[PDB]
Amino acid sequence: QTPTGIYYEVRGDTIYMINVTSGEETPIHLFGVNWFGFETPNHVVHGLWKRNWEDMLLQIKSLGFNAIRLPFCTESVKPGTQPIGIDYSKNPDLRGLDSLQIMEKIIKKAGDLGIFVLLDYHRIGCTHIEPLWYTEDFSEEDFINTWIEVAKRFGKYWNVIGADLKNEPHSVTSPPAAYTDGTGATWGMGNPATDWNLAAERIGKAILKVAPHWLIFVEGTQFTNPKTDSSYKWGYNAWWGGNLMAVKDYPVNLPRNKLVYSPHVFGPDVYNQPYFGPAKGFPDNLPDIWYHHFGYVKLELGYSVVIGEFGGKYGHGGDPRDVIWQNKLVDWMIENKFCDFFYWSWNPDSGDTGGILQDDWTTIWEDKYNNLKRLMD
Ligand SMILES: OC[C@H]1O[C@@H](O[C@H]2[C@H](O)[C@@H](O)[C@H](O[C@H]3[C@H](O)[C@@H](O)[C@H](O[C@H]4[C@H](O)[C@@H](O)[C@H](O)O[C@@H]4CO)O[C@@H]3CO)O[C@@H]2CO)[C@H](O)[C@@H](O)[C@@H]1O
User: N or C terminus: fewer CB in 10 A for the chain?
Assistant: First the structure.
């Protein structure tokens, strides 16, 4: 059942937390942020050159968030990786700790604060997101074994809700090549080399054996299979980790009380999507685009859907259409009861999106935050 005394499950489209000792079971909401850096050359969450790590946690909690998605790369969850970019004068308790002991300390404290953590295997290397869950010198078996060691260790922390199996499965070539050419992810192709729907089942099963109490989060790909993608006019224009159009015909085969679908969705600050042109009816055209790419998974099919990344500069140094985009997206989440989400990012040092923090790592973008906090009321 559980090593921590806490057990997570999905009933209907809602995540519940069970306490086996008190017997309490309540629905939870994930009002989340992404705090990144363990996936980069820093090997640690960013901003610890400017801030104390507990204080960052306390500030996140104080803004109403109760969940952090923590991106990691393979090197950061191995014993002995040295972090760069910590002011030890501000973080004395982190002196001489390796990146793993820091991740342990951060998650423990999060727990004490009542913050859920979702572990995200964000990159295999520490430089960029790979299209597949393996590379030339890192196999799916190494990927799975990395998740098993992570689940073995982090399964002991009550507030770790689960595993976001791989960030942003995607493509590096164009369709039609992308479907068969083995360089990118697919879904419903019937090809184990590339089918993210099949890979998710294999990786999720491995993790549930060691952490049966966890949820498994599964993202979209970019392209799926040609019949799915051509069946919608914007079928070729989903984000990385954003195409869930294949779930209806090819659902992922994990237990229904364990599985959470986790699409990503972005604004004009990340990529100038063609449906962002007002001549295409932006922004009033978006709800139908969101619905087709991922929203029907919940609205029509009844699955838990947690948006795992979304954000943008909200007009601070970026495309002024980002303000309209983020407003419209949060309107649609609220009206369709997409209440669980993780914003990208808490960090201001996201080059195309900024974050909830400003560049001083201390003050927030009030307007951006005010729009988002509508989901938290
Ligand atoms: O991790 C530290 C790093 O994060 C960067 O922020 C990234 C996230 O890490 C990532 O999860 C996500 O990635 C974007 C990616 O940056 C875009 O390049 C990619 O663009 C695609 C689009 O999805 C397609 O529809 C279109 O056809 O192709 C374009 C590119 O050709 O979209 C994905 C999301 O789907 O988002 C975050 C924002 O980019 C920070 O920017 C960086 O500073 C941090 O170091």
Answer: C
